[PDB]
Every structure is written in structure tokens, then in C-alpha cells.
Design an enzyme around this catalytic site. Structure first.
Site, PDB file in Angstrom:
ATOM      1  N   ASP A  65       0.867  -1.136   0.000  1.00  0.00           N
ATOM      2  CA  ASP A  65       0.000   0.000   0.000  1.00  0.00           C
ATOM      3  C   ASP A  65       0.944   1.238   0.000  1.00  0.00           C
ATOM      4  OD1 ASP A  65      -1.783   2.171   0.738  1.00  0.00           O
ATOM      5  OD2 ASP A  65      -2.970   0.916   1.998  1.00  0.00           O
ATOM      6  N   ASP A 100      -0.288   7.698  -9.746  1.00  0.00           N
ATOM      7  CA  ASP A 100      -1.142   7.131 -10.747  1.00  0.00           C
ATOM      8  C   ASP A 100      -2.041   6.106 -10.071  1.00  0.00           C
ATOM      9  OD1 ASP A 100      -2.229   6.204 -13.138  1.00  0.00           O
ATOM     10  OD2 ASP A 100      -0.520   5.093 -13.623  1.00  0.00           O
TER      11      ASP A 100
HETATM   12  C1  LIG Z   1      -4.006   0.505 -13.076  1.00  0.00           C
HETATM   13  S1  LIG Z   1      -3.049   1.889 -12.455  1.00  0.00           S
HETATM   14  C2  LIG Z   1      -3.748   2.296 -10.851  1.00  0.00           C
HETATM   15  C3  LIG Z   1      -3.229   1.312  -9.820  1.00  0.00           C
HETATM   16  O1  LIG Z   1      -3.400   1.935  -8.572  1.00  0.00           O
HETATM   17  C4  LIG Z   1      -3.197   0.833  -7.709  1.00  0.00           C
HETATM   18  N1  LIG Z   1      -3.475   1.231  -6.350  1.00  0.00           N
HETATM   19  C5  LIG Z   1      -4.687   1.492  -5.817  1.00  0.00           C
HETATM   20  N2  LIG Z   1      -4.625   1.763  -4.496  1.00  0.00           N
HETATM   21  C6  LIG Z   1      -3.272   1.774  -4.220  1.00  0.00           C
HETATM   22  C7  LIG Z   1      -2.462   1.990  -3.035  1.00  0.00           C
HETATM   23  N3  LIG Z   1      -3.082   2.310  -1.868  1.00  0.00           N
HETATM   24  N4  LIG Z   1      -1.114   1.817  -3.150  1.00  0.00           N
HETATM   25  C8  LIG Z   1      -0.510   1.431  -4.273  1.00  0.00           C
HETATM   26  N5  LIG Z   1      -1.199   1.240  -5.423  1.00  0.00           N
HETATM   27  C9  LIG Z   1      -2.535   1.393  -5.426  1.00  0.00           C
HETATM   28  C10 LIG Z   1      -4.271  -0.120  -8.192  1.00  0.00           C
HETATM   29  O2  LIG Z   1      -4.146  -1.411  -7.591  1.00  0.00           O
HETATM   30  C11 LIG Z   1      -4.060   0.036  -9.688  1.00  0.00           C
HETATM   31  O3  LIG Z   1      -3.308  -0.976 -10.291  1.00  0.00           O
HETATM   32  N1  LIG Z   2      -2.355   3.897 -15.489  1.00  0.00           N
HETATM   33  C1  LIG Z   2      -3.811   4.009 -15.905  1.00  0.00           C
HETATM   34  C2  LIG Z   2      -4.677   4.058 -14.634  1.00  0.00           C
HETATM   35  C3  LIG Z   2      -5.190   5.492 -14.471  1.00  0.00           C
HETATM   36  N2  LIG Z   2      -5.665   5.723 -13.118  1.00  0.00           N
HETATM   37  C4  LIG Z   2      -7.138   6.079 -13.068  1.00  0.00           C
HETATM   38  C5  LIG Z   2      -8.088   5.028 -13.662  1.00  0.00           C
HETATM   39  C6  LIG Z   2      -9.521   5.365 -13.186  1.00  0.00           C
HETATM   40  C7  LIG Z   2      -9.985   6.678 -13.849  1.00  0.00           C
HETATM   41  N3  LIG Z   2     -11.423   6.973 -13.533  1.00  0.00           N
HETATM   42  C8  LIG Z   2      -9.051   7.820 -13.442  1.00  0.00           C
HETATM   43  C9  LIG Z   2      -7.528   7.496 -13.578  1.00  0.00           C
END
Ligand SMILES: CSC[C@H]1O[C@@H](n2cnc3c(N)ncnc32)[C@H](O)[C@@H]1O
Ligand SMILES: NCCCN[C@H]1CC[C@H](N)CC1
Ligand SMILES: CSC[C@H]1O[C@@H](n2cnc3c(N)ncnc32)[C@H](O)[C@@H]1O
Ligand SMILES: NCCCN[C@H]1CC[C@H](N)CC1
Lengths: 281, 281
Positions: B138, B156
Site C-alpha cells: 500500500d 497514478d
Molecule cells: C491501473 S493503475 C492504478 C493502480 O493503482 C493501484 N493502487 C490502488 N490503491 C493503491 C495503493 N493504496 N497503493 C498502491 N497502489 C494502489 C491499483 O491497484 C491500480 O493498479
Molecule cells: N495507469 C492508468 C490508470 C489510471 N488511473 C485512473 C483510472 C480510473 C480513472 N477513472 C481515473 C484514472
């Protein structure tokens, strides 16, 4: 509640939907299927032939950008024409300019005007201004016939399927050129850069056969497919439409919600892949 | 063929749909529901908890803008962190900078990485670069624990419903501030200006409690709701992130499809109604 869904052969494989609070009116006019509904989150919505024309929530983005881009660049616009635009949103933005002496609108479908006057009173308010004259006819014919020339023409058409099919060809652009003053401007709604770039290239090539300076700008509006729409920008002088010549400071413009002096020039800064496609036209 | 539809309490009353060519993979990971399908017109699509994360057709717009905005402003970035970003698109854009010595990614869900390596090979290619180090945890914990400081942090994340719920609060922004170099930058994906402006205001107010300069930029991407998404931009110096310090001319950047030197500054020219809402924060 049911949902309205916008599906089209013009953007296959994708669709945007809005939830319906209440259907307000449907008719088959001489030209189009007309649907007015109150959505749950975007207010009232006007639909022609299954395609969203406006919603109360975001229409200002499109009507402000299409009107104020060419009207801050025209130095002293006196006569403006709107092609299409039955809902009156462009006219509403035009009336704001005290200087304008006449605003002509050529809208093929009088049902759209009458529907807008009843159900979209904050969009159609401009019809009350004694400077506005309405012509119910196909703009393709009107532009062949008009005697006057205009300082600015704003092509606010629906899409190429339906009665707007005549506004998307080389002939149409020659008619626009001839109806403009020697220093006049035309803006036209133009294809989303995310959808048919081939269409943008075709339209640009049409405009470039006549106009000195042909620019493309992009507007963010969420209830149009892909969440954005282009402005095809046609100028007879080399200076073009990216740079406003005036600021909108008087009281009639206080209320503007999208368009400002910096957004104006920014709309013309496009994605790399778009510049590459339209560099050798 | 069936259609996938993106419905959410985060944007009630509206929905975007894509037609499905073929479902490729579905699982319930430790954190999220994961869906990979090939759409008919946007290529492959990654879905987490019913929300579109990327499609092959438009992902470059988001990954280019989020990476190259802060990486053309940082003078000599050596250590970059990606928060979230399991698909690898940011890392792909980062690897392009020969100068970078290390790229850490903290992604909570290793299924997303492994799914991307299998089904999205042109997005996940960056994982092969010996400069990239993966931490499965996390980011809320990682940022409390990391010893290093970074020149740039790119948040991201997926949306606030689900495991990203920890990345959208005041505490999170303090952690980001502390993990950055004295002159370091953070960009974070941030709410569409068409949807919850209250959220943008909240996030801006969070960032402003710590950062000297907090800017908001907008990206056009059609498969995110309302067709656009913001970048919350956090700088420790007064100079901010609107103006790039370098141009991307070397061979690794030849292939860029959205991001250019002028788009960079243009993304920061926002609609009038947005500037008015976020002027007294
Ligand atoms: C697909 S790119 C966005 C990514 O954010 C990741 N993500 C969401 N919550 C967290 C967090 N608390 N820490 C690290 N990554 C995260 C999700 O698992 C997803 O793959
Ligand atoms: N790397 C692509 C993931 C982009 N993160 C989010 C996906 C969900 C969307 N509503 C906003 C950006
Ligand atoms: C709702 S704004 C767009 C308007 O364009 C109008 N329109 C479409 N085709 C033409 C045309 N050929 N001439 C004039 N107006 C048109 C439509 O009837 C619609 O009201
Ligand atoms: N005056 C609002 C009508 C805008 N004209 C068009 C409606 C159909 C859209 N797909 C594109 C613009």
C-alpha cells in the site's frame, strides 16, 4: 428510471448514456426525430435523431467557445450569421455584443426553434432581441441566395447524417467564403480528434482550398462523444483566429462560464498525433 | 456482442460503454475485481472494480501528460517514484530519460502488474529495464517507510472507492511532501472538472497546506468519465509546473503521441467557472 443511450454508426463500438428523470416531448418533425428529456444530472437535454445536441449543464462550453473565439478576433463585427443553431445558444452569446447590428440565423427545422423557446428558455432568450432575424431554410440554399456579406459566420450544425449532410463538402466552404466580408471569419463545429481524423483532414483540405489560414481548436464538452469537439477556423488574412483582439470586460460578459482570453489561445494547442496527421494537407 | 458499461456512484446519472470483441481474463484479486477485454474499437481494456483504467487506444494521452509534465520541469531527475501504476504506462514513459538512475514503483496489487505483463505487452515493457524496482504494498505504508527522497513522485492511482481510498487525504499529501527532494515535484491524477469540483477544491486545499505552488491541469482522454481528467501539480518552489525546462528531442521521444512543449503549458489554461471555484482556497 430508464436511460437514454447515444449509439451511432459515426462512432461505432462506444456509447454515452444519461439517466432520464422525465421525457418532456417527442415528435417527428419534417426533418428529424426530436426528443427533449430532463436528465437526472445534466438538466434538460435536446436530442435530434438519437444524438445529443445539448444539455443545460455543459452547453455554455460549446456556445461560448464557438461564439467568442471568432467575435473577439473580428474587430467591429456588425452583421453575424448562424448556420443551424436552432436552440439559440450561439445567438444568446452574440446578443452580448452591443456593437452587433444584425444577427441572421438560418435553421432548416422550425420545430427545433419552437421546442427551444418552450423547453429551453435560458438558451432561447436571444430570440427576443430585435436584432435577430430567423430564416427557416436549408443553409445550403440560403448561402447561395443571400445578398449581404457577414463579418462572422458560425456553422452550428448537427452531424452529417440527416439534414446537415449538405454542410460537409467543398461546395459548402466556397459558399461560406463568398458570404463573408474580405476580412471575415467562419468557425464550424468539426470532428472530435479522438474519432475520425480522416474527416478533420478532409474538412481542413476543403477550407484550405479557399482560406488563407485554417486552424483547428478543441473544446472539452462531456456530453459530446469522446468528451470533446473541434472548431474548424477559417480566416481570409494570414493572421488567423488563435489570438483575441479584445477582452470581454463589460457587464454583459460578467456571467461567462468557460471562455476567457487565455483559453482562447490554448484551445489551439493540439495533441502530437493530430499535428502530425494534418501537417502535409 | 455484449457491451461493457462503466456505471458508478462517483458519477451518478451517466455512463460510458464499449462494445466487447472478446473477454480475455477476469479474477477477484486480494483487492479488486479485475477485468481484461478486447473492445471492438479501443483495443484491449483494463477494468478494475468496474472502472476503466486504460485502453490501448488512448492510454498514451494520460501516461505522456502525467510523466512529461513533471519530468521536463525537473532539471536532472535521478530517482522517480510511481504510486499505483501497476500497468506500467508511466514507467514506460520514464525509461525514456537516459538520465534517470532509479525508478521505484509501489503498487498494492501484484495481479495488476502480472496481468499487464501478459495482456498489455506494449504498456508493461518498462518492467524489463534494470533501473526499475517493484514494491508490492500500500503506498500509504511505503511512503511512511521509504528512506530515499525522490526528484519526482507520480501518483497514478485508481479512484477513491477501493484500495486507493487511502491516497485522497491531508495525511497522504504530507507523506508525499516529506518523500520529495527540497526542489522535488509531485503530480497526482485528480477529479474531472465536469464532475466533483468540490473534490478538486478539497485536494487543492490539501496540497496548499504544504506546497508553495499548487496548479491543476486538464488532459483530454475519452475513456475516462466526462472525457477528461485533471493533474494535481505540487511544487516546493514558487515557479510551479506550467513551463517545461527542456525539449524532448532525443530518439527515445520520437514516438510521442500527445505530449509536446506547447501542450504542456496549454493544459493549465482552465475554464472560467473552474478558476472562479478555486480562487479563494
Ligand atoms: C491501473 S493503475 C492504478 C493502480 O493503482 C493501484 N493502487 C490502488 N490503491 C493503491 C495503493 N493504496 N497503493 C498502491 N497502489 C494502489 C491499483 O491497484 C491500480 O493498479
Ligand atoms: N495507469 C492508468 C490508470 C489510471 N488511473 C485512473 C483510472 C480510473 C480513472 N477513472 C481515473 C484514472
Ligand atoms: C440544435 S443546433 C443544430 C441545428 O442544425 C440544424 N441544421 C441541420 N441541417 C441544417 C441545414 N442544412 N441548414 C440549416 N440548419 C440545419 C438542425 O436542424 C439543428 O437544429
Ligand atoms: N447548439 C448545440 C448543437 C451542437 N451541434 C452538434 C450536436 C451534435 C454533436 N455530436 C456535435 C455538435
Amino acid at each position: 428510471k430508464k436511460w437514454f443511450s447515444e449509439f451511432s454508426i459515426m462512432w461505432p463500438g462506444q456509447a454515452f448514456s444519461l439517466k432520464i428523470k422525465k421525457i418532456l416531448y417527442e415528435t417527428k418533425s419534417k426533418y428529424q426525430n426530436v426528443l427533449v428529456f430532463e436528465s437526472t444530472t445534466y438538466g434538460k437535454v435536446l436530442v435530434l435523431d438519437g444524438v445529443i445536441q445539448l444539455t443545460e449543464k455543459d452547453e455554455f462550453a460549446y456556445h461560448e467557445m464557438m461564439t467568442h473565439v471568432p467575435m473577439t478576433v473580428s474587430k467591429e463585427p456588425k452583421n453575424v450569421l448562424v448556420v443551424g443553431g436552432g436552440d439559440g445558444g450561439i445567438i444568446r452569446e452574440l446578443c452580448k455584443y452591443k456593437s452587433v447590428e444584425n444577427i441572421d440565423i438560418c435553421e432548416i427545422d422550425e420545430t427545433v426553434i419552437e421546442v427551444s423557446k418552450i423547453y429551453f428558455k435560458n438558451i432561447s432568450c436571444g430570440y427576443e432581441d430585435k436584432r435577430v432575424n430567423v430564416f427557416i431554410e436549408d443553409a445550403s440554399k440560403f448561402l447561395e441566395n443571400v445578398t449581404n456579406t457577414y463579418d462572422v459566420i458560425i456553422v452550428d450544425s448537427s452531424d452529417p447524417i440527416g439534414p446537415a449532410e449538405t454542410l460537409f463538402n467543398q461546395n459548402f466552404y466556397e459558399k461560406i467564403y463568398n458570404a463573408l466580408k474580405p476580412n471575415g471569419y467562419c468557425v464550424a463545429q468539426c470532428e472530435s480528434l479522438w474519432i475520425h481524423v480522416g474527416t478533420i483532414k478532409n474538412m481542413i483540405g476543403y477550407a484550405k482550398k479557399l482560406f488563407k489560414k485554417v486552424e483547428y481548436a478543441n473544446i472539452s464538452i462531456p456530453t459530446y462523444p469522446c468528451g470533446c469537439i473541434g472548431i474548424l477556423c477559417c480566416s481570409k488574412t494570414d493572421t488567423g483566429l488563435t489570438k483575441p483582439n479584445k477582452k470581454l470586460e463589460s457587464k454583459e460578459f460578467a456571467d461567462l462560464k468557460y471562455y476567457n482570453y487565455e483559453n482562447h489561445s490554448a484551445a489551439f494547442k493540439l495533441p502530437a498525433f493530430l499535428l502530425k496527421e494534418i501537417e502535409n494537407i
